[PDB]
């Protein structure tokens, strides 16, 4: 769909960590999809990271949030 694609074209750029956070909150199967539509250099990476997220920040998330929602044409449930 149009969602996933914009999210990939967008996420491809960001820090392996930045992706790690976003995808963290995402829906697990939809997580694997994007995580899938990215090259193997980062998959392994983004995934090693997504594993090591004991931490969590309320201002960086709410920052990325207010950043997609004005780049990707509409952030849904997951981040809500």
């Amino acid at each position: 769909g149009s969602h996933m694609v914009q999210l990939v074209n967008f996420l491809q750029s960001e820090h392996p960590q930045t992706i790690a956070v976003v995808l963290s909150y995402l829906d697990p199967p939809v997580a694997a999809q994007i995580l899938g539509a990215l090259p193997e250099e980062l998959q392994t990476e983004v995934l090693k990271r997504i594993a090591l997220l004991e931490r969590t920040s309320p201002e960086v998330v709410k920052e990325i949030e207010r950043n997609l929602e004005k780049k990707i044409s509409g952030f849904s449930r997951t981040f809500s």
């Binding site: 960001e14 820090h15 392996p16 960590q17 930045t18 956070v21 004991e54 960086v60 920052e63 950043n67």
Partner: protein, 188 residues
């Protein structure tokens, strides 16, 4: 052109900026971060070239300030920091220009950082830093004529086997008005 008296003034101030800075980076990075201040006089052209491309540069000013200064951070520390404040460890510093969130999240980080600088100065000239522009390429800033002299403040941010530099470029064309009032008529 700077005095050998006025130089000792700036050493005292900025040395203090490194103390609060040391303690700020430590509270961000979550582990101890030692910071060593070094200061020197250099041509603006001589500084602007010692800046690696690309890097994270932030040209700022204040209310009572006539001109603008530079606050540059080398990308390795920059990306190491971003990694941390996002729930990650920070093991690989990529060599490219920071993105939308990257610069937007790091902007507020250099604002806090910049503030403490303004606080180490509070005894001489209080000012509220108001960041004018951010640029990833140095051969694009050109703050003031390339021949002018600058007070370059260098902060050796070290920890672990890691060690980077934070530079604050204090131009003479911003230091001349408060130079004459504070280090000259009543002091001398």
């Amino acid at each position: 052109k700077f005095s050998k008296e006025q130089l000792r003034t700036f050493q005292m101030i900025h040395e203090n900026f490194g103390r609060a800075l040391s303690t700020y980076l430590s509270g961000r990075l979550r582990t101890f971060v030692d910071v060593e201040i070094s200061i020197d006089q250099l041509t603006y052209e001589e500084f602007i070239r010692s800046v690696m491309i690309p890097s994270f540069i932030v040209i700022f000013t204040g209310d009572v300030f006539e001109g603008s200064a530079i606050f540059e951070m080398r990308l390795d520390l920059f990306y190491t920091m971003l990694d941390i404040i996002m729930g990650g460890p920070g093991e690989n510093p990529p060599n490219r220009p920071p993105t939308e969130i990257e610069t937007s999240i790091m902007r507020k980080e250099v604002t806090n950082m910049l503030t403490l600088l303004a606080q180490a100065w509070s005894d001489f000239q209080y000012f509220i830093p108001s960041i004018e522009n951010v640029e990833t390429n140095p051969q694009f800033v050109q703050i003031v004529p390339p021949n002018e002299i600058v007070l370059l403040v260098t902060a050796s941010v070290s920890w672990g086997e890691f060690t980077s530099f934070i530079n604050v470029c204090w131009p003479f064309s911003l230091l001349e008005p408060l130079l004459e009032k504070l280090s000259d008529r009543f002091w001398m």
